[PDB]
Amino acid sequence: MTERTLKVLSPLHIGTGNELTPVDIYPRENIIHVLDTERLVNDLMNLGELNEILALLKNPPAYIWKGYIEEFHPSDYSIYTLKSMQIKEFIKLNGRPYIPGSSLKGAIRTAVLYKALKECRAVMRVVSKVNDVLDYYMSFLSRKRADDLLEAIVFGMEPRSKIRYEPKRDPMKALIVRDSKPVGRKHLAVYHVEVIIWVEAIEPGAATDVEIHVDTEALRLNADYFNGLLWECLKERGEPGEVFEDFLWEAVDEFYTAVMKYETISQVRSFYASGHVLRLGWGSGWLAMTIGLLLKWENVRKKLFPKTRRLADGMPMGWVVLE
Amino acid sequence: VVGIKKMLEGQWEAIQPYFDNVVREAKNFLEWSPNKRLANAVTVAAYLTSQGLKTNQVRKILDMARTTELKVKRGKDDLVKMRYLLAYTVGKYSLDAFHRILDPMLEVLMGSPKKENFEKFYDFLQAVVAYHKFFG
Amino acid sequence: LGVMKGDVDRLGEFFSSMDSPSKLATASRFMDYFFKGYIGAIIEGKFGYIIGDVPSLRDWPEEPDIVVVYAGGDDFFIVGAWDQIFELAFRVRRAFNAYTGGKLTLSVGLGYFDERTPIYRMADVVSERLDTAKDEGRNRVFVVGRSRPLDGKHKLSYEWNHYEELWRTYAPRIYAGNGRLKGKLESKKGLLWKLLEIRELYVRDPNDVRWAYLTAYLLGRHGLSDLFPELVGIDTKAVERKEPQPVYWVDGVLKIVLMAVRR
Amino acid sequence: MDRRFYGKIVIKGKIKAVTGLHIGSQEIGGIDNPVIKDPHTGLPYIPGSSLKGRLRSLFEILVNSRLGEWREKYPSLANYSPGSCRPDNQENCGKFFNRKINRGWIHVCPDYETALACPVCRLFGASGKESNFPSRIIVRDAFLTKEWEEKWRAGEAITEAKIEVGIDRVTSQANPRTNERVVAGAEFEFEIIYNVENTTHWRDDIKNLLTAMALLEDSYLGGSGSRGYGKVKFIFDSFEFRPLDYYRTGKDEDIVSIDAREKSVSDILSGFDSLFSEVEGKL
Amino acid sequence: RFYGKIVIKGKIKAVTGLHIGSQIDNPVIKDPHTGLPYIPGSSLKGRLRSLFEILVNSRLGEWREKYPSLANYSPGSCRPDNQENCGKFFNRKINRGWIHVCPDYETALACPVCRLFGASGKESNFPSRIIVRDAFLTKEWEEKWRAGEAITEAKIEVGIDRVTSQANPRTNERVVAGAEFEFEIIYNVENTTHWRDDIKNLLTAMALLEDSYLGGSGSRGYGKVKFIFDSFEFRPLDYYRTGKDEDIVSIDAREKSVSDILSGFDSLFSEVEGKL
Amino acid sequence: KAKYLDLKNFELALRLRPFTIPEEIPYARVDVPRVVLDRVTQDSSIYFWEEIRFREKSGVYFLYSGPREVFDGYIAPAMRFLGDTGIGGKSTWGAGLFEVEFHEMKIDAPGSEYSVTLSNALPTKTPVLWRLLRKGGWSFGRRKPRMTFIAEGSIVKNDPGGMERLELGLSHEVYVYGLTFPLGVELPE
RNA sequence: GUGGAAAGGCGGGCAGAGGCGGUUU
Ligand SMILES: [Zn+2]
Ligand SMILES: [Zn+2]
Q: Which of E22, E77, E95 sits opposite F39 (nearest CB)?
A: E77
What is the Cα–Cα distance from C97 to C119, expressed in whole angstroms? 30
Spatial CA neighbour of F137 closest among F92, F176, F93, F179: F176
E78 annotated as ligand-binding: no
Instruction: Outline where DSSP puts E strands in chain C.
Output: 2-8, 66-70, 75-80, 106-112, 140-142, 158-159, 175-177, 180-181
Residues of D in contact with F38 (CB under 8 A): 132
E47 CA to G10 C1' distance (Å): 11
| d(CA D107, ligand 1 centre) in Å | 7
CA distance to partner chain D, nearest, from residue E150 (Å): 8
Q: Which residues of C touch D (CB under 8 A)?
A: 190, 214, 217
Residue at shortest CA–C1' distance from G2: F88
CB A261 within 8 A of CB A281: no
C189 CA to G15 C1' distance (Å): 14
Total tally of structural domains belonging to chain E:
1
Tell whether F105 is within 8 A of chain D (Cβ). Answer: no
Which strand (E) or helix (H) includes residue A145? Answer: none
Distances (CA, A) of A139 to A116, A289, D86: 21, 22, 38
| d(CA D94, ligand 1 centre) in Å | 13
What is the Cα–Cα distance from B11 to C242, expressed in whole angstroms? 40
What is the Cα–Cα distance from D178 to D164, expressed in whole angstroms? 6
Overall fold of domain C1-163 = Alpha-Beta Plaits (3.30.70)
Ligand found nearest the CA of D97: 1
Residue at shortest CA–C1' distance from G7: F36
Give exposure, D104-137, as e/b (b: 16+ Cβ within 10 Å).
bbbbbbbbbebbbbbbbbbbbbbbbeebbbbbbb
Residues of C in contact with E23 (CB under 8 A): 114
Distances (CA, A) of A22 to A42, A64, B99, F45, F78: 19, 10, 21, 71, 84
Experimental method: cryo-EM
CB E77 within 8 A of CB E98: yes
A10 CB-to-strand G distance under 7 Å: no
Ligand found nearest the CA of D117: 1
Spatial CA neighbour of F133 closest among F146, F117, F144, F142: F146
F136 CA to G3 C1' distance (Å): 7
What is the Cα–Cα distance from C64 to C44, expressed in whole angstroms? 7
What is the Cα–Cα distance from D242 to D250, expressed in whole angstroms? 11
CB atoms closer than 10 angstroms to residue E152: 22
Nearest chain E residue to C195 by CA: give it. Answer: E24
Which strand (E) or helix (H) includes residue E6? Answer: strand E4-14
A50 CA to G11 C1' distance (Å): 64
**Interstrand relation of F114-117 and D7-17 (parallel, antiparallel or unpaired):** unpaired
Bases of chain G below 7 A from a protein C-beta are: 1-25
Mutation for F interface: E42, E58, E73, E136, most F CBs within 10 A: E42
**How big is the A-B interface in CB pairs under 8 Å?**
27
A76 CA to G15 C1' distance (Å): 38
CB D99 within 8 A of CB D118: no
3-state secondary structure of D88: coil
E4 CB-to-strand G distance under 7 Å: no
E171 CB-to-strand G distance under 7 Å: no
Tell whether E23 is within 8 A of chain A (Cβ). Answer: no
Give exposure, A9-47, as e/b (b: 16+ Cβ within 10 Å).
bbbbbbbbeeebbbbbbbbeeeebbbbebeebbeeeeee
With a CB cutoff of 8 Å and minimum separation 6, the contacts of A10 are A204, A283, A315, A316, A317, A318, A319, A320
Give the experimental resolution in Å: 3.0
DSSP of A25-90? B--SSSS--B--HHHHHHHHHTT--HHHHHHHHH-----TTTHHHHS----S----------EEPP
Under an 8 A CB cutoff, do A57 and B90 touch?
A: no
CB atoms closer than 10 angstroms to residue A78: 14
What is the Cα–Cα distance from F36 to F42, expressed in whole angstroms? 9
CB D221 within 8 A of CB D51: yes
DSSP state of B6: H
Helices (H), chain A: 37-45, 50-58, 67-70, 101-119, 122-125, 134-141, 147-150, 217-221, 229-235, 240-263, 267-273, 286-289, 297-303
D182 CB-to-strand G distance under 7 Å: no
Residue at shortest CA–C1' distance from G19: D166
Spatial CA neighbour of D262 closest among D283, D280, D239: D239
Nearest chain F residue to D116 by CA: give it. Answer: F41
DSSP state of D78: S
D240 CA to G17 C1' distance (Å): 38
CB A114 within 8 A of CB A294: yes
CB D177 within 8 A of CB D164: yes
Ligand found nearest the CA of D118: 1
E41 CB-to-strand G distance under 7 Å: no
Give the largest Cα separation in chain B, rounded: 46
Spatial CA neighbour of C6 closest among C76, C73, C69: C76
CA distance to partner chain C, nearest, from residue B123 (Å): 8
Helices (H) and strands (E) in chain F, counts: 3, 9
Spatial CA neighbour of A244 closest among A188, A189, A177, A175: A175
Distances (CA, A) of C113 to C1, C80, C131, E140, F34: 5, 11, 19, 36, 15
The domain of E167 spans 1-276
Under an 8 A CB cutoff, do C190 and D28 touch?
A: no
Residues of D in contact with E217 (CB under 8 A): 49
What is the Cα–Cα distance from F14 to A84, expressed in whole angstroms? 95
Interface of D with A in 28-47 (CB under 8 A): none
What is the Cα–Cα distance from E219 to F42, expressed in whole angstroms? 13
Give exposure, A269-280, as e/b (b: 16+ Cβ within 10 Å).
eeeeeeebbbbb
Helices (H), chain E: 41-57, 105-108, 114-117, 143-147, 195-208, 237-242, 264-268, 272-275
D125 CA to G11 C1' distance (Å): 8
With a CB cutoff of 8 Å and minimum separation 6, the contacts of C64 are C43, C44, C80, C81, C84, C88
CB E60 within 8 A of CB E70: yes
* Residues forming a β-bridge with A320: A8, A278
Ligand found nearest the CA of E85: 2
Phi, psi torsion values for D100, nearest 5 degrees: -90, 145
CB C39 within 8 A of CB C76: yes
What is the Cα–Cα distance from C205 to C212, expressed in whole angstroms? 13
* Residues forming a β-bridge with D195: D8
E157 CB-to-strand G distance under 7 Å: yes
Nearest nucleic acid nucleotide to E23, CA to C1' distance: G9
Tell whether F36 is within 8 A of chain D (Cβ). Answer: no
What is the Cα–Cα distance from B128 to B46, expressed in whole angstroms? 9
**Interstrand relation of C106-112 and C140-142 (parallel, antiparallel or unpaired):** parallel
Tell whether B60 is within 8 A of chain D (Cβ). Answer: no
| d(CA D124, ligand 1 centre) in Å | 8
CA distance to partner chain D, nearest, from residue B99 (Å): 18
Helices (H), chain D: 48-64, 112-115, 119-124, 146-154, 202-216, 244-249, 264-265, 272-275, 279-282
Decide: B and A in contact? Rule: 3+ Cβ pairs under 8 Å.
yes
What is the Cα–Cα distance from A9 to F68, expressed in whole angstroms? 104
Phi, psi torsion values for E156, nearest 5 degrees: -100, 110
CB C133 within 8 A of CB C141: yes
What is the Cα–Cα distance from B78 to B83, expressed in whole angstroms? 8
CB E175 within 8 A of CB E166: no
DSSP of D156-219? --SEEEEEEEEEPTTT--EEEEEEEEEPTT-EEEEEEEEE---SSSHHHHHHHHHHHHHHHTTS
Nearest chain D residue to E201 by CA: give it. Answer: D248
CB D205 within 8 A of CB D192: no
Nearest nucleic acid nucleotide to C187, CA to C1' distance: G15
Distances (CA, A) of B64 to B72, D225, E269: 12, 29, 54
* Residues forming a β-bridge with F50: F31
What is the Cα–Cα distance from F6 to F12, expressed in whole angstroms? 10
CB E41 within 8 A of CB E133: yes
The edge-to-edge listing of strands for the beta sheet with F114-117 is F155-157, F114-117, F182-184
What is the Cα–Cα distance from D47 to D38, expressed in whole angstroms? 10
Phi, psi torsion values for B52, nearest 5 degrees: -75, 135
Q: Which chains touch B (3 or more CB pairs under 8 A)?
A: A, C, D
Phi, psi torsion values for E218, nearest 5 degrees: 70, -55
Nearest chain F residue to C136 by CA: give it. Answer: F23
What is the Cα–Cα distance from E111 to E70, expressed in whole angstroms? 7
3-state secondary structure of A162: coil
Amino acid at A249: W
**Vertex C88, ends C83 and C90: CA angle to 5°?**
110
What is the Cα–Cα distance from F87 to F81, expressed in whole angstroms? 10
* Residues forming a β-bridge with F28: F53
Nearest nucleic acid nucleotide to F88, CA to C1' distance: G2
- For the annotated binding site of D, the residues are 107, 109, 118, 121
Phi, psi torsion values for C37, nearest 5 degrees: -105, -40
* D7 torsion bin: left (phi>0), alpha (psi -120 to 50), beta (else): left
Distances (CA, A) of A104 to A99, A101, A108, B34: 8, 5, 7, 52
Spatial CA neighbour of D187 closest among D220, D149, D223: D149
